[PDB]
Structure formats: C-alpha cells, structure tokens
Symmetry: C3
Subunit: 300 residues, 3 copies
C-alpha cells in the first residue's frame, strides 16, 4: 500500500518553529512530511507526519492567544492540512488543504484552556490520522488550576493506535495492531518521543519519592477510547479536557473519548517503577504501557 | 434473513400522534411497522420501526408529565413493545409486548429532565434495536438550563449503527457496516431525517454567523460508544444526559455511552461549513459525519 | 490451551480471611488457585482465581486503613500477585510475584474512598485478568455519602468478560464470547455469585416497592467499557469511582471505563422485575443482563 511517489522517501525531522509576535499573538510553522518511524522493534511505519514526529510536536500557547499557523507541505503528491481542536475557525476556509510543495497560512484564536488534539483535516480524515497526522496543543489557563501550587513535576503523554500500513479496510474494520504512548517535552531535558511500543518502558519518565506529578494527556485515537490509569496511585485531581471547571477527585481511571484530553495529578509515595496504562488490557498488551521510575533523588 | 411475512412489505410512514390531556398528562400514540429506509446510497434496509422512521419520531414532554402511551403493532408477525428511558415504570408490567394487529396502552411518569433513549423491549432487545426500533424522548426541565438565554438556535441529533440485515451473529460479533446521524424536528421548518450516511451532508443543518447553537444529542447504539465533536468550535457548556446539574464547560469532545445523551452548546464564529462527527474515525468514515452550514444570514 | 500441570485440577474455594488488627489496620489473606467455574450453561472455564471465585471475593475496608495483605499461591506452576487500585504502593516492590506453593505479604494504605478494581499484576497482566484474576475492593468514606440517609437497600455488582480459554490471540484481538454480571455479598443473606450468564436472571436480586437502591459497581474488563443502565428507573445520584465529590444526578446510563467504578442510586416505584444491563447490547446479548425483583414485601 505504498504510494509510488513515497517509495524510498524518508524526510528528516524538521524542528517546530514558534515565536510570539504580540501579547496575544503567536506564529507557528509546521511541515507535512513523510518519515520512517520504528513503531515496534523491527517494524518501520512510513508515517504521514507533522515535522517528522508521530504524534507531532507539542504546541503550547496561552488562553486568548491567536495562532498564525503556517503549514509547509513537503509531501511530493498528497495534500495535507491542519485542524486544531483548541480553536474557533471556519473549517471550510481555515482547515483547508495545502498542496504538495506549497505553503498555507491560517489565523484563528485559542479562547479555551485545555489539552486539545490537533490533526490533519484532509479527506479521508481517518486515513491521515491513522497514518500519523495527529498531535496535541496545550492552552494554558489564564488563572492556572486550583492545585498548581501542589504540583512538583509535569509531563505530557499521548495515546495513539497503529494499523496495517495505509490500509483503509483495516483502518475502518480491523483491530489496532499496536496501541502506544509517547511523551512530548515541556521543559529542557524532558524526553520527546514518538508513538512506539518500547521507548517509555526502556527509558522511563523520572520522578522523586513523595512528588505530586501532573500529566497532560490526550487519546488521539483514531478509533479507540482510553481507560487511563497509573499503577500504584489514585488520581488526586482530574480536570476533564484540561478545563479547570471540570474537576473530579480521587479517580482510579479516567475515561477518554477519541480526541479526549485531561490534566491528571497523582502522588507517588514510594521508590520503584510505576506502569502507566490504558486499562483496556488488549491495548496495553499491544504496546500501551509506559513507565515512571521514582527514586529517592529523581535522578536515574 | 428476511422473514417470509415481511417479504415485499413496506408500510408507509404514519405521523406520531400526541396531545396534552391535562397540565401534567400527555397522550402519545405510535405504531410499530416495517418500512424500507435508504441507509446508504443504493442500500435499502427493511427496518423495524416506530412510525416508519429509524430512529423513530421525536417525543418532547415537560418534567413531571405522565405519559399515556399507546403502541399499535402493524407488523403481521413480530411482537413489539416500548421502553422509555425517561420514565419510572415496572418493566415486566409496563414495557410488555403488543402482538401483531393489536394495540396496548401503558402509563408512566417522566420525573427527570434530559435527553433519553427509547427503544423496543422485546427479547432479543439487541435484534429490535439493531433493526431500527430506537429513538429519543426529551423531557424539558421545569426551570430550564442556566444558559437558556444565551442560545440562539437548537437542533436534535441522534447517532445509530446499521449492521448486516437482521443478522444476529453480526449484531453480536461484527463491526457496524454504517454509523450515522439523523436530525429530528423541534420546531416547524426543522429537518426530520432518518439514520443514513448522506442526508445531513447534502442538506446541512443551517445557522447564522455568531450564533450559539444547542444540540440535544443521544447515541442510541446499539453497540458503540460515541466521541461527539463539532469541528471548528469547542463546547461552551455541556449537560450530561441533559440534566442541568451535570454541567461541564469547555469540552472539545463529549464521551457518550450507548444510550447516552447530552445537551451541548457551542458558538460558530465564522461563515463556512462545520462537520459534526463521532471522533472514533472508523465510524465517521462509515457514515457518521453531519454538516452545519453557517451563513451571514442563516438562510441557504 | 490447558497447561499440563493444570489438567484435572479443580481446587475447592477457600474463604477469604480478614481481621481488623488496629483502628486503622486490617489483615487480609487470599489464595491464588485454579478452579472450574460454569460461566454459561454447559460451559466450564478452568479459571485463574482468588479464593476460587471469579471475580474474586469482596473486600471492604474504611478510608485510612492500611492493608496487610497475604497471598498464598496454590497454583502448582504459575506465579501470581495482587494489585489493589485502592492503594498507594510501589508496584515493583509491593505488587510482585508469589511463586507456586509460597506466600507473600505486602502492606499499603487505602487513603481514598470508592469502588476499586483489584487484579493480578503478573506479566502478561491481560492473561491473568482474562483468566479470572479480578475483583473489587470497596473503601468506605469517612463521612459517608450525602445521600446515605435516603438509601434503603444496597448490593454490589461487577461486570467482566470471558474469552476463549487461555487464548492470548483471542484476548488481544477477539470479541468477548461472554459478558457477565456477578454480585458479591455485603451483609449476611446477600447472594455471592461468580461471573456467569444466568445466575442473576434465575435468582434475581430482591427489593421492595418504593425503595431507593444503591449499587456499588465496577467494570473489571479486561477489555470493554460499560454503559451501565437499570431498566424502568433513572439514577437519582451517581458518584464516579465512589468518591463522594464526583456527584452526578439524573443519569439514564453511566459510562464506565475498563476498571471504572461507581456508586449509583435509584428508586423502584412499582412491583415487577427490572433488568440491569450494559447498554452495549451486543454484550447484553452475550450474557450481561442481571435482574432485580421488586415485590410489595421485598421477599421472594
Ligand atoms: O493497574 N494496572 O492494571
Ligand atoms: O475535528 N474533526 O476531527
Ligand atoms: O433499558 N434497556 O435497554
Ligand atoms: Cu492583553
Ligand atoms: Cu502573523
Ligand atoms: Cu495528512
Ligand atoms: Cu478532530
Ligand atoms: Cu510535593
Ligand atoms: Cu494516587
Ligand atoms: Cu401543576
Ligand atoms: Cu389518558
Ligand atoms: Cu421491535
Ligand atoms: Cu434501554
Ligand atoms: Cu447569540
Ligand atoms: Cu466552541
Ligand atoms: Cu484514629
Ligand atoms: Cu500486620
Ligand atoms: Cu494470576
Ligand atoms: Cu489495574
Ligand atoms: Cu425509602
Ligand atoms: Cu430512576
């Protein structure tokens, strides 16, 4: 199922570009590009990506920022596009296709705090998402969260599925071959990984005994819901979609729809390694287990 | 899988009958009937229906109304019945079968505000729901919703699946062949459609730039959950099951169980066409995309 | 797929042992054992169990109790282990394997009120859960629930799936063969059953006309979410995961993730038999229907 013009194509990752251009305005430039990603050991997926990552690079803006977004399409033959769930926009004017070897710029406001999916909007959308064109944009709430002062350390996790390569029958009708977590960096030194079955097991996220950890999470799908759970703890506080008003306490497991987000916070009380799962254990068995290593110092 | 006595049967739609009979009492009369519905282009499903619609006709009552419900069974051979999720009733006395060519009347109160599924209760219930015997009853809250004064325009949407015709193995064990939206009229001039893959794409719901839209939504299944999302906006306010107390804000996507309802409200800020999806994109690809056309005047 | 050392093995159920050892400390002793369970009429599953029950025996503790848990592994060849979702623990030190014919003791606090899953933690966790090593621990809130004084009668229900026997391909990739409810006793005289397709239909839970019923519920999976609904009523109050803060009202149906819990309360207004379902009707058809028989006296 490899398009003739994609045979042998493996475009090197290109860094995300972002710069603030006013107190409430931010420029973002991404690419659409075709990049080989190792999704399981020995298994390469020639993914349709933003910037050579799948999920794509993390975007963080402030509530009330208007985003001036440019997509540079490096794919030699397939059009691509961008839909941010954070924004208010006209889909038929602002989420439109950018043709091969062209760029397009679109402007829209991020009025709402939270942890939002982004993805390509090009028909068939299922094909673009399943092939890798998904990601997260975080919109920071103007007044924070009521538990901000309690949080010691924070990371971003994203859940996605992988199917048989570019196979629309499988995408529509088949079980996922792999379900995976990735982490995207918020601060210098944080890991930045792609959706694969192994990296966050072999290179766990790090924390220190006694810390309260915040995770910004989103299940991008394309197709499955997620039963998000951290082994050995309970979520002290949960904010559905990352909106501070949607505040639950003491949850064992957080139900995420496809594209669903949350801010979750939990305390790690003892040294050890703590798995992070979707509790739909067929999906966990097919890759969706990450690890958090908790040490007396927070160092590995 | 077509029952001998249903071969060639296509009973014309019969209008819902409703009339208020007291300040807190309402008569409703439906039929059970066998009616051909075009669920995808060129694909007829000889559905088991209420009133020749699938999902069935919309019912709207007020909180505290007692419903005096009559079902007239026009099916020549299969018994049918009615279960309203809105009501408090004895299932074994009030949700019982009405035999072919007979009628039955049942009385029960709708004590709780919200957006409730209704469906046939006849064993096997899966068979009756999958073949088309589902619908929505809205119970209006005595004191409204706190955001009532902000809403400019409102519609009803229902999600359902379609399987291989009357195939209990497929109903139990197979993926849906189609997943679809329909709209049911609240006010004169609103569309009133059946669950199909195309009508709400070709004849979009209409709105005006700047409006706040309310949707009353229910995912009737039979089998899937729904990740309900409007492209190009964020839900300002969500009331789970349509109960005013269950109030979320700023949600990108609303997780609906099978039979789950909600009242969702969102603002459309720019002219254009806005898709409405379940974000489980396998289901969207198999039909579950509706459209909302937003114009400077609200006219098409 | 029957391990040689399990052929012909059917270890008799062993009672749960629990005793309070201080105002905030409780001893619990379970077994891991291999026991034949009739999951559907004529269908024996040689389950991997705690104490010869699947789901395992109910555990009830108070918020703030530290649990001193001993597992005695009676399996001749497979290691087993215990993970309580209620507790804060080091998974790599406290949820570790107990080898055949050995015991292990682990101590950890239950700081959070609610209705929590427990299950084996031994890799592959999917295999242990699917084969029967799941259950519920209830942690009673120090200050109760705000609706405690309204509740007349209470029971515990658990939902689980069963797959082809010890078949990891089916566990990962196949639909469940059966989906089932069981009830676990809270007070003397309550039923105590295993996850099967028939017992709670033939021997319904009992209640009296006019009562408000509380159910403590958990969907242990392993793989499916649950759309929990009681026919003929509406949930007056719902507490997600059994935490009193997570308070919804007037829900028709409660969405439970895999491992998700709730406390749900509803009123039965008329004599009759009331089905209890997951509204994902493929699962209901494959076993997941229990019954509640409501009489003028509450006696059968
Ligand atoms: O909490 N691990 O299923
Ligand atoms: O927001 N369309 O996936
Ligand atoms: O309420 N029985 O689907
Ligand atoms: Cu300013
Ligand atoms: Cu600019
Ligand atoms: Cu694309
Ligand atoms: Cu989207
Ligand atoms: Cu701290
Ligand atoms: Cu915790
Ligand atoms: Cu009155
Ligand atoms: Cu009457
Ligand atoms: Cu019917
Ligand atoms: Cu129902
Ligand atoms: Cu307005
Ligand atoms: Cu919006
Ligand atoms: Cu004390
Ligand atoms: Cu002790
Ligand atoms: Cu085990
Ligand atoms: Cu678990
Ligand atoms: Cu009472
Ligand atoms: Cu009720």
């Amino acid at each position: 199922n490899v398009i003739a013009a994609h045979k042998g194509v493996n475009q090197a990752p290109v860094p995300l570009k972002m710069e603030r251009v006013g107190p409430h305005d931010v420029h973002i430039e991404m690419t659409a590009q075709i990049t080989d990603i190792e999704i399981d050991k020995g298994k390469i997926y020639k993914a349709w990506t933003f910037n050579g990552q799948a999920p794509g690079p993390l975007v963080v803006v402030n509530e009330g920022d208007t985003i001036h977004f440019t997509l540079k399409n490096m794919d030699p033959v397939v059009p691509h596009s961008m839909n941010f769930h954070a924004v208010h926009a006209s889909p038929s004017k602002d989420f439109i296709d950018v043709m091969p070897n062209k760029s397009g710029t679109f402007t829209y406001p991020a009025n709402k705090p939270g942890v939002f999916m982004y993805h390509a909007a090009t028909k068939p959308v299922l094909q673009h998402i399943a092939n890798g064109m998904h990601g997260v944009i975080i919109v920071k709430p103007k007044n924070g969260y009521p538990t901000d002062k309690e949080v010691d350390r924070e990371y971003v996790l994203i859940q996605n599925e992988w199917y048989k390569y570019n196979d629309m029958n499988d995408f529509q009708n088949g079980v996922p071959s792999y379900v995976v977590f990735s982490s995207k960096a918020l601060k210098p030194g944080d890991p930045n990984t792609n959706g694969d079955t192994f990296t966050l097991k072999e290179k766990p996220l790090l924390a220190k005994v006694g810390e309260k950890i915040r995770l910004y999470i989103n299940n991008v799908g394309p197709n499955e819901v997620s039963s998000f759970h951290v082994v050995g703890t309970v979520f002290d506080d949960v904010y559905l979609d990352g909106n501070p008003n949607n505040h639950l306490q003491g949850m064992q497991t957080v139900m995420l729809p496809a594209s669903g987000g949350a801010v979750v916070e939990f305390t790690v009380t003892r040294p050890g390694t703590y798995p992070i799962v979707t509790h739909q254990f067929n999906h966990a068995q097919k890759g969706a287990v990450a690890m958090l290593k908790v040490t007396e110092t927070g160092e590995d």
